[PDB]
């Protein structure tokens, strides 16, 4: 199992860690203008198609990565 932030809608500053489900294996942050999302993800919908559709978001970036809680905001607090 990895643990990953998971908030259930977009926030600033998602704190919440959880133990995801064994299915998800990746953490995903996305920043979508306004809305910055932070959740238990895949692989397989780690590209730009599957985040928006997903996300039902229009315009956005994103980050997946495999270690624990590494899907924190760093890289935007730091910019």
Not at 12 to 18: F, I, M, P
Not at 42 to 55: G, S
Request: proline content about 3%; aromatic content about 12%.
């Amino acid at each position: 199992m990895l643990q990953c932030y998971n908030c259930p809608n977009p926030t600033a500053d998602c704190k919440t860690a959880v133990n995801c489900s064994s299915d998800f294996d990746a953490c995903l942050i996305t920043k979508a203008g306004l809305q910055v999302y932070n959740k238990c993800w895949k692989f397989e919908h780690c590209n730009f198609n599957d985040v928006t559709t997903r996300l039902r978001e229009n315009e956005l970036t994103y980050y997946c990565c495999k270690k624990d809680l590494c899907n924190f905001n760093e890289q935007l607090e730091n910019c």
